[PDB]
Amino acid sequence: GAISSVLNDILSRLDPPEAEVQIDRLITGRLQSLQTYVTQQLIRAAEI
Amino acid sequence: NDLCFTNVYADSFVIRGDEVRQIAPGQTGKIADYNYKLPDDFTGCVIA
């Protein structure tokens, strides 16, 4: 949902008071993707 | 009326209606950028 996936390009064009809102969406999205990877690895390790 | 505070400061000055709206967090312009700048987490009220 952010205007662009490259963090440096958005931070270089938007003012701080509004850039913090756009960055928060990328932080939240990438952190949730990382949690999914770790969870599937814990189950797969139990099978081996 | 219920809260208590450590200290209170009154900053008093004269401005003109044009751009007077710029006294607010995260605003841009000649006054906000070169004359008087409020922090992003300012907690209080502006009276005119």
mmCIF file of N, CA and C in Angstrom:
data_model
loop_
_atom_site.group_PDB
_atom_site.id
_atom_site.type_symbol
_atom_site.label_atom_id
_atom_site.label_comp_id
_atom_site.label_asym_id
_atom_site.label_seq_id
_atom_site.Cartn_x
_atom_site.Cartn_y
_atom_site.Cartn_z
ATOM 1 N N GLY A 1 0.772 -1.224 0.000
ATOM 2 C CA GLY A 1 0.000 0.000 0.000
ATOM 3 C C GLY A 1 0.808 1.282 0.000
ATOM 4 N N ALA A 2 2.122 1.211 0.197
ATOM 5 C CA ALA A 2 2.934 2.418 0.189
ATOM 6 C C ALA A 2 3.099 2.926 -1.241
ATOM 7 N N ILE A 3 3.481 4.200 -1.364
ATOM 8 C CA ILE A 3 3.627 4.790 -2.692
ATOM 9 C C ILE A 3 4.775 4.162 -3.475
ATOM 10 N N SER A 4 5.780 3.614 -2.793
ATOM 11 C CA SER A 4 6.871 2.952 -3.497
ATOM 12 C C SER A 4 7.571 1.990 -2.548
ATOM 13 N N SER A 5 8.061 0.880 -3.105
ATOM 14 C CA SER A 5 8.737 -0.128 -2.296
ATOM 15 C C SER A 5 10.151 0.257 -1.882
ATOM 16 N N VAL A 6 10.785 1.211 -2.557
ATOM 17 C CA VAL A 6 12.145 1.625 -2.219
ATOM 18 C C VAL A 6 12.076 2.703 -1.138
ATOM 19 N N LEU A 7 12.597 2.373 0.043
ATOM 20 C CA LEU A 7 12.492 3.252 1.204
ATOM 21 C C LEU A 7 13.229 4.577 1.013
ATOM 22 N N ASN A 8 14.390 4.560 0.353
ATOM 23 C CA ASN A 8 15.132 5.805 0.150
ATOM 24 C C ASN A 8 14.451 6.779 -0.809
ATOM 25 N N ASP A 9 13.691 6.293 -1.788
ATOM 26 C CA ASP A 9 13.050 7.206 -2.732
ATOM 27 C C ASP A 9 11.866 7.948 -2.117
ATOM 28 N N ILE A 10 11.101 7.289 -1.247
ATOM 29 C CA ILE A 10 9.997 7.972 -0.575
ATOM 30 C C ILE A 10 10.508 8.934 0.493
ATOM 31 N N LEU A 11 11.503 8.519 1.278
ATOM 32 C CA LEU A 11 12.034 9.397 2.316
ATOM 33 C C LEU A 11 12.658 10.658 1.730
ATOM 34 N N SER A 12 13.195 10.572 0.514
ATOM 35 C CA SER A 12 13.814 11.707 -0.163
ATOM 36 C C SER A 12 12.826 12.671 -0.811
ATOM 37 N N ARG A 13 11.537 12.333 -0.903
ATOM 38 C CA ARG A 13 10.568 13.238 -1.507
ATOM 39 C C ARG A 13 9.465 13.738 -0.584
ATOM 40 N N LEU A 14 9.149 13.037 0.499
ATOM 41 C CA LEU A 14 8.060 13.433 1.378
ATOM 42 C C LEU A 14 8.592 14.032 2.675
ATOM 43 N N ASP A 15 7.857 15.014 3.197
ATOM 44 C CA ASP A 15 8.251 15.669 4.432
ATOM 45 C C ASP A 15 8.097 14.734 5.634
ATOM 46 N N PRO A 16 8.955 14.889 6.642
ATOM 47 C CA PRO A 16 8.914 14.023 7.841
ATOM 48 C C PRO A 16 7.522 13.822 8.425
ATOM 49 N N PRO A 17 6.711 14.874 8.608
ATOM 50 C CA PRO A 17 5.396 14.652 9.243
ATOM 51 C C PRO A 17 4.487 13.692 8.499
ATOM 52 N N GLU A 18 4.680 13.503 7.198
ATOM 53 C CA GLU A 18 3.878 12.557 6.435
ATOM 54 C C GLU A 18 4.648 11.303 6.048
ATOM 55 N N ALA A 19 5.969 11.407 5.887
ATOM 56 C CA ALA A 19 6.799 10.242 5.599
ATOM 57 C C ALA A 19 6.748 9.184 6.697
ATOM 58 N N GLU A 20 6.613 9.583 7.964
ATOM 59 C CA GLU A 20 6.487 8.580 9.022
ATOM 60 C C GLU A 20 5.252 7.704 8.847
ATOM 61 N N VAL A 21 4.154 8.260 8.335
ATOM 62 C CA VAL A 21 2.969 7.433 8.123
ATOM 63 C C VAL A 21 3.193 6.421 7.005
ATOM 64 N N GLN A 22 3.812 6.844 5.900
ATOM 65 C CA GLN A 22 4.058 5.925 4.790
ATOM 66 C C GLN A 22 5.070 4.842 5.150
ATOM 67 N N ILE A 23 6.106 5.196 5.911
ATOM 68 C CA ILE A 23 7.125 4.219 6.285
ATOM 69 C C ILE A 23 6.546 3.164 7.215
ATOM 70 N N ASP A 24 5.664 3.571 8.128
ATOM 71 C CA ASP A 24 5.056 2.627 9.060
ATOM 72 C C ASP A 24 4.370 1.475 8.334
ATOM 73 N N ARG A 25 3.781 1.731 7.166
ATOM 74 C CA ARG A 25 3.145 0.650 6.417
ATOM 75 C C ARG A 25 4.165 -0.372 5.919
ATOM 76 N N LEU A 26 5.335 0.084 5.468
ATOM 77 C CA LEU A 26 6.360 -0.849 5.004
ATOM 78 C C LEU A 26 6.980 -1.626 6.158
ATOM 79 N N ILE A 27 7.180 -0.975 7.304
ATOM 80 C CA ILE A 27 7.735 -1.666 8.464
ATOM 81 C C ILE A 27 6.797 -2.778 8.911
ATOM 82 N N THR A 28 5.506 -2.466 9.024
ATOM 83 C CA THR A 28 4.528 -3.457 9.459
ATOM 84 C C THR A 28 4.412 -4.613 8.470
ATOM 85 N N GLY A 29 4.401 -4.312 7.171
ATOM 86 C CA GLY A 29 4.293 -5.370 6.178
ATOM 87 C C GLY A 29 5.478 -6.320 6.130
ATOM 88 N N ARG A 30 6.702 -5.795 6.225
ATOM 89 C CA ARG A 30 7.869 -6.677 6.180
ATOM 90 C C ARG A 30 8.039 -7.492 7.452
ATOM 91 N N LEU A 31 7.669 -6.940 8.602
ATOM 92 C CA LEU A 31 7.792 -7.687 9.848
ATOM 93 C C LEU A 31 6.837 -8.874 9.890
ATOM 94 N N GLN A 32 5.623 -8.712 9.366
ATOM 95 C CA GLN A 32 4.668 -9.816 9.351
ATOM 96 C C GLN A 32 5.099 -10.931 8.397
ATOM 97 N N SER A 33 5.724 -10.581 7.273
ATOM 98 C CA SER A 33 6.251 -11.593 6.358
ATOM 99 C C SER A 33 7.361 -12.421 6.999
ATOM 100 N N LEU A 34 8.252 -11.776 7.754
ATOM 101 C CA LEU A 34 9.308 -12.496 8.466
ATOM 102 C C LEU A 34 8.763 -13.488 9.489
ATOM 103 N N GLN A 35 7.710 -13.124 10.225
ATOM 104 C CA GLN A 35 7.146 -14.051 11.206
ATOM 105 C C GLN A 35 6.583 -15.309 10.558
ATOM 106 N N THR A 36 5.971 -15.183 9.383
ATOM 107 C CA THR A 36 5.443 -16.359 8.699
ATOM 108 C C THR A 36 6.539 -17.344 8.307
ATOM 109 N N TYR A 37 7.652 -16.852 7.767
ATOM 110 C CA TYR A 37 8.767 -17.731 7.421
ATOM 111 C C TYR A 37 9.270 -18.532 8.618
ATOM 112 N N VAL A 38 9.486 -17.870 9.754
ATOM 113 C CA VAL A 38 9.997 -18.552 10.944
ATOM 114 C C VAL A 38 9.038 -19.631 11.443
ATOM 115 N N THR A 39 7.736 -19.340 11.469
ATOM 116 C CA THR A 39 6.759 -20.321 11.944
ATOM 117 C C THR A 39 6.740 -21.599 11.112
ATOM 118 N N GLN A 40 6.763 -21.488 9.783
ATOM 119 C CA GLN A 40 6.761 -22.698 8.962
ATOM 120 C C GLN A 40 8.027 -23.519 9.163
ATOM 121 N N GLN A 41 9.159 -22.865 9.422
ATOM 122 C CA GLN A 41 10.404 -23.584 9.669
ATOM 123 C C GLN A 41 10.365 -24.382 10.966
ATOM 124 N N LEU A 42 9.671 -23.889 11.994
ATOM 125 C CA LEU A 42 9.581 -24.636 13.246
ATOM 126 C C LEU A 42 8.808 -25.940 13.083
ATOM 127 N N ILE A 43 7.728 -25.935 12.302
ATOM 128 C CA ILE A 43 6.990 -27.171 12.051
ATOM 129 C C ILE A 43 7.801 -28.138 11.189
ATOM 130 N N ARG A 44 8.414 -27.637 10.114
ATOM 131 C CA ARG A 44 9.200 -28.494 9.227
ATOM 132 C C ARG A 44 10.383 -29.141 9.940
ATOM 133 N N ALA A 45 11.012 -28.425 10.870
ATOM 134 C CA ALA A 45 12.105 -29.005 11.648
ATOM 135 C C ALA A 45 11.640 -30.180 12.499
ATOM 136 N N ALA A 46 10.428 -30.102 13.044
ATOM 137 C CA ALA A 46 9.894 -31.200 13.847
ATOM 138 C C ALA A 46 9.709 -32.478 13.034
ATOM 139 N N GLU A 47 9.330 -32.359 11.760
ATOM 140 C CA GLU A 47 9.200 -33.548 10.918
ATOM 141 C C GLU A 47 10.537 -34.249 10.695
ATOM 142 N N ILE A 48 11.598 -33.491 10.414
ATOM 143 C CA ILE A 48 12.914 -34.095 10.204
ATOM 144 C C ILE A 48 13.416 -34.761 11.478
ATOM 145 N N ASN B 1 -8.630 21.100 34.077
ATOM 146 C CA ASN B 1 -8.783 21.375 35.502
ATOM 147 C C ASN B 1 -8.340 20.226 36.404
ATOM 148 N N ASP B 2 -8.244 19.002 35.890
ATOM 149 C CA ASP B 2 -7.877 17.865 36.729
ATOM 150 C C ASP B 2 -6.375 17.587 36.749
ATOM 151 N N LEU B 3 -5.721 17.662 35.596
ATOM 152 C CA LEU B 3 -4.287 17.433 35.483
ATOM 153 C C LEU B 3 -3.456 18.470 36.238
ATOM 154 N N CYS B 4 -2.201 18.091 36.490
ATOM 155 C CA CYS B 4 -1.173 18.936 37.079
ATOM 156 C C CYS B 4 0.077 18.878 36.217
ATOM 157 N N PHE B 5 0.818 19.983 36.211
ATOM 158 C CA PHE B 5 1.945 20.156 35.314
ATOM 159 C C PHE B 5 3.156 20.638 36.099
ATOM 160 N N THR B 6 4.333 20.402 35.521
ATOM 161 C CA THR B 6 5.579 20.804 36.162
ATOM 162 C C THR B 6 5.837 22.297 36.005
ATOM 163 N N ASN B 7 5.700 22.814 34.786
ATOM 164 C CA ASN B 7 5.921 24.225 34.494
ATOM 165 C C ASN B 7 5.147 24.590 33.239
ATOM 166 N N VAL B 8 4.815 25.873 33.114
ATOM 167 C CA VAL B 8 4.096 26.376 31.953
ATOM 168 C C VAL B 8 4.850 27.581 31.407
ATOM 169 N N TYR B 9 4.994 27.644 30.084
ATOM 170 C CA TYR B 9 5.621 28.768 29.404
ATOM 171 C C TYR B 9 4.642 29.440 28.452
ATOM 172 N N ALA B 10 4.615 30.772 28.459
ATOM 173 C CA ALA B 10 3.773 31.540 27.547
ATOM 174 C C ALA B 10 4.658 32.307 26.568
ATOM 175 N N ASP B 11 4.661 31.881 25.305
ATOM 176 C CA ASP B 11 5.385 32.555 24.230
ATOM 177 C C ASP B 11 4.421 33.491 23.504
ATOM 178 N N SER B 12 4.661 34.795 23.597
ATOM 179 C CA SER B 12 3.752 35.804 23.066
ATOM 180 C C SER B 12 4.419 36.609 21.957
ATOM 181 N N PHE B 13 3.732 36.737 20.822
ATOM 182 C CA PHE B 13 4.251 37.475 19.676
ATOM 183 C C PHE B 13 3.077 37.912 18.808
ATOM 184 N N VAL B 14 3.368 38.783 17.842
ATOM 185 C CA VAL B 14 2.372 39.323 16.917
ATOM 186 C C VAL B 14 2.631 38.819 15.501
ATOM 187 N N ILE B 15 1.571 38.324 14.857
ATOM 188 C CA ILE B 15 1.627 37.718 13.532
ATOM 189 C C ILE B 15 0.446 38.268 12.736
ATOM 190 N N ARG B 16 0.410 37.958 11.441
ATOM 191 C CA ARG B 16 -0.670 38.408 10.575
ATOM 192 C C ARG B 16 -1.456 37.220 10.036
ATOM 193 N N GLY B 17 -2.753 37.456 9.800
ATOM 194 C CA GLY B 17 -3.669 36.371 9.462
ATOM 195 C C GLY B 17 -3.178 35.487 8.333
ATOM 196 N N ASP B 18 -2.593 36.094 7.307
ATOM 197 C CA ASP B 18 -1.958 35.342 6.235
ATOM 198 C C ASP B 18 -0.780 34.550 6.783
ATOM 199 N N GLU B 19 -0.864 33.222 6.685
ATOM 200 C CA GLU B 19 0.077 32.240 7.228
ATOM 201 C C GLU B 19 -0.069 32.042 8.733
ATOM 202 N N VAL B 20 -0.957 32.772 9.415
ATOM 203 C CA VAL B 20 -1.141 32.559 10.849
ATOM 204 C C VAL B 20 -1.489 31.106 11.146
ATOM 205 N N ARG B 21 -2.116 30.413 10.192
ATOM 206 C CA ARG B 21 -2.379 28.987 10.344
ATOM 207 C C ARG B 21 -1.106 28.154 10.448
ATOM 208 N N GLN B 22 0.054 28.711 10.091
ATOM 209 C CA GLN B 22 1.298 27.946 10.120
ATOM 210 C C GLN B 22 1.816 27.677 11.527
ATOM 211 N N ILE B 23 1.189 28.220 12.568
ATOM 212 C CA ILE B 23 1.579 27.882 13.931
ATOM 213 C C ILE B 23 0.894 26.582 14.323
ATOM 214 N N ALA B 24 1.517 25.466 13.971
ATOM 215 C CA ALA B 24 0.976 24.136 14.203
ATOM 216 C C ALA B 24 2.088 23.126 13.942
ATOM 217 N N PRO B 25 1.998 21.936 14.533
ATOM 218 C CA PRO B 25 3.027 20.921 14.289
ATOM 219 C C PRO B 25 3.075 20.512 12.824
ATOM 220 N N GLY B 26 4.292 20.371 12.309
ATOM 221 C CA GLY B 26 4.486 19.901 10.947
ATOM 222 C C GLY B 26 3.975 20.799 9.839
ATOM 223 N N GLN B 27 4.124 22.111 9.989
ATOM 224 C CA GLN B 27 3.709 23.068 8.976
ATOM 225 C C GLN B 27 4.944 23.684 8.328
ATOM 226 N N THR B 28 4.789 24.128 7.083
ATOM 227 C CA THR B 28 5.871 24.735 6.324
ATOM 228 C C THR B 28 5.550 26.180 5.960
ATOM 229 N N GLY B 29 6.603 26.929 5.637
ATOM 230 C CA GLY B 29 6.492 28.339 5.319
ATOM 231 C C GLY B 29 7.575 29.205 5.933
ATOM 232 N N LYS B 30 7.605 30.482 5.538
ATOM 233 C CA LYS B 30 8.642 31.398 6.007
ATOM 234 C C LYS B 30 8.680 31.495 7.529
ATOM 235 N N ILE B 31 7.512 31.537 8.171
ATOM 236 C CA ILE B 31 7.465 31.661 9.626
ATOM 237 C C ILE B 31 7.867 30.354 10.297
ATOM 238 N N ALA B 32 7.267 29.242 9.874
ATOM 239 C CA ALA B 32 7.557 27.956 10.496
ATOM 240 C C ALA B 32 8.998 27.514 10.276
ATOM 241 N N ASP B 33 9.603 27.884 9.150
ATOM 242 C CA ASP B 33 10.961 27.449 8.846
ATOM 243 C C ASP B 33 12.050 28.404 9.320
ATOM 244 N N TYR B 34 11.793 29.715 9.353
ATOM 245 C CA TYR B 34 12.818 30.687 9.712
ATOM 246 C C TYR B 34 12.560 31.486 10.981
ATOM 247 N N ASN B 35 11.338 31.518 11.499
ATOM 248 C CA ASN B 35 11.044 32.378 12.639
ATOM 249 C C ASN B 35 10.664 31.627 13.905
ATOM 250 N N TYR B 36 9.707 30.705 13.842
ATOM 251 C CA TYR B 36 9.269 30.004 15.044
ATOM 252 C C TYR B 36 8.789 28.613 14.665
ATOM 253 N N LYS B 37 9.466 27.593 15.186
ATOM 254 C CA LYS B 37 9.203 26.200 14.849
ATOM 255 C C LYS B 37 8.842 25.423 16.107
ATOM 256 N N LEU B 38 7.669 24.734 16.078
ATOM 257 C CA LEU B 38 7.159 23.872 17.134
ATOM 258 C C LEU B 38 7.658 22.442 16.947
ATOM 259 N N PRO B 39 7.888 21.706 18.029
ATOM 260 C CA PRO B 39 8.316 20.314 17.887
ATOM 261 C C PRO B 39 7.168 19.433 17.423
ATOM 262 N N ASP B 40 7.531 18.246 16.934
ATOM 263 C CA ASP B 40 6.526 17.327 16.411
ATOM 264 C C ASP B 40 5.580 16.820 17.494
ATOM 265 N N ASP B 41 6.071 16.634 18.722
ATOM 266 C CA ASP B 41 5.254 16.134 19.821
ATOM 267 C C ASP B 41 4.768 17.240 20.755
ATOM 268 N N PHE B 42 4.512 18.436 20.232
ATOM 269 C CA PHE B 42 4.071 19.537 21.077
ATOM 270 C C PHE B 42 2.731 19.202 21.712
ATOM 271 N N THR B 43 2.622 19.387 23.028
ATOM 272 C CA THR B 43 1.349 19.167 23.705
ATOM 273 C C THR B 43 0.861 20.443 24.376
ATOM 274 N N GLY B 44 -0.152 21.063 23.789
ATOM 275 C CA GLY B 44 -0.701 22.294 24.314
ATOM 276 C C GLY B 44 -1.597 22.945 23.284
ATOM 277 N N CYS B 45 -1.941 24.201 23.549
ATOM 278 C CA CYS B 45 -2.836 24.944 22.672
ATOM 279 C C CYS B 45 -2.327 26.338 22.312
ATOM 280 N N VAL B 46 -2.692 26.746 21.098
ATOM 281 C CA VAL B 46 -2.396 28.046 20.498
ATOM 282 C C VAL B 46 -3.675 28.873 20.405
ATOM 283 N N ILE B 47 -3.621 30.083 20.966
ATOM 284 C CA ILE B 47 -4.749 30.998 21.108
ATOM 285 C C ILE B 47 -4.471 32.284 20.340
ATOM 286 N N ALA B 48 -5.495 32.793 19.651
ATOM 287 C CA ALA B 48 -5.362 33.990 18.832
ATOM 288 C C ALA B 48 -6.656 34.796 18.881
#
